[PDB]
Symmetry: C4
Subunit: 164 residues, 4 copies
């Protein structure tokens, strides 16, 4: 795989199946998958920071990013390519050293510019075709984990090393 | 696809998988799919209003229709066909210029009177067979998006034009 | 299809996929499927009452049962066969004229004794073999609707009748 | 099947599909499956205690364990192998007389040391390959029940005997 210095990810439709739960009181939910925490685990084990880029803006995602010790959190993002470029500039890397996973229209410009692009199997066809690696899983199934494990070449020997 | 001037949609079993969540206190939830918001995006991009016709009546749905800037919302509807015909009069257009998607008994009469009828793959067979185009997706899987994209013939060229 | 005078049903694993949602405060949810309402619709269309027999006892099911105008609701039932029999006596009918659908251990004695026993596809093997008709659907998938439609011989002619 | 004197279980990804529901207010949900209660029923029927070992710590799980009358609950466990050894030491039990089911990295060391290891079909491959029996079911689908019934050899004869 390409040398990756930063992993960036969308939330809805990647860390979730796109589900947006609404009640009668103005409250809102998302359903995360505990499996995706291993994505952060493996990135951090390799010395790679992870950032969230999302167009939504919620306390739900603030809490999840905190629980998982995600390095960067940008919400209400209107232009994900610009946000990514700006963070790359701050970090001293280029987009070719970024791996980004996203599933929809607001992800497309960024997906086309990154070193490794991932798109869940549940995504619209014209977004899926931008993926540069195959991902088997759908949003919310542990596809963030699947993406990280492939991008970083996590293998049986890595597994054995961590559970000793 | 015929010149459509209005897209109408049911909620439960279309925008959702029919799930109705109840707690112990009289609160209630629905689970929407973020993918469907693209259905409103594509409709608006092409100059077409979207309207919701639902037999239920909840703040859940009012909040979702607001978020998505849906043009028309009718809840607690007893007779969807007549509600459609009214709106067609209010707006000065014909049932023939309407695309409607629904999934159950209360949708049947209207489905039979519109220019393009859509029914999710998850619907009962006698409603399914009313559909005039094939929809692959189940309620809550982004089938509203699928419908709008088929109805408006959204293609790769449209995609390339909106993500520049 | 035998003559049926009473339709009875379990809740968890039939009207739901067995899901029991718990929060941090002692509240609880279940997820119903709007499709199952049509089961009550068709039963009432044929002049057949429906009763709920459940071992759990929740406000959740109280509120759902009332919304659907279910005819009998028995919760915290420990002996479902005895409860059915008592109900049969009230209506002057026998077990051979009852159709019951259930998915688990607390249902087996009753399933064995009714005129038509239905068990969702999702149920344990040793319960599924008690079913006297085949049901395709899993719990929470509209399997109560499937059951009623099969039991009452609901066909396309019935459908055309009710929308016309 | 070997002699089993204690069944131990992880929660997230075994008792659930890994789902972690967050709202806007700091509350949290898990979705259990009523099917898994039969896991406890059969263990207790055979006189075998059940213990939960989870890395998470929530009222959600405390309440669930209490309602199911689970014999031991350990939350916020950082080293499951050690927690299992200490519980076993109190009870007089060898790890070879234990059946444990788990799905992720924090379960691997203990899975490798128990008499029967179970892993849901939904788990990562490097965990699933530690399983010493085949489990068909995914987390949240009643795979804890499947595990219990397999390891205790629950068969049609037990089912016939337990319903009179
Ligand atoms: Mg997304
Ligand atoms: Mg509907
Ligand atoms: Mg049940
Ligand atoms: Mg786990």
């Amino acid at each position: 795989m390409k040398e990756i210095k930063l992993i960036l990810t969308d939330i809805d439709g990647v860390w979730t199946d796109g589900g947006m739960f609404y009640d009668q009181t103005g409250n809102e939910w998302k359903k995360f998958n505990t499996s995706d925490s291993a994505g952060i685990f493996w990135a951090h084990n390799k010395g790679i920071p992870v950032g969230i880029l999302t167009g939504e803006k919620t306390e739900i995602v603030r809490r999840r990013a905190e629980k998982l010790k995600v390095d960067y959190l940008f919400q209400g993002v209107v232009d994900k390519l610009s946000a990514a470029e700006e963070l790359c500039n701050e970090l001293g890397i280029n987009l070719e050293q970024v791996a980004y996973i996203g599933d929809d229209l607001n992800d497309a410009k960024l997906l086309k510019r990154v070193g490794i692009a991932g798109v869940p199997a549940s995504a619209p066809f014209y977004i899926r075709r931008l993926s540069t690696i195959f991902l088997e899983k759908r949003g919310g199934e542990g596809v963030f984990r699947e993406f990280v494990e492939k991008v970083l070449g996590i293998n049986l020997e890595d597994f054995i090393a961590v559970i000793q």
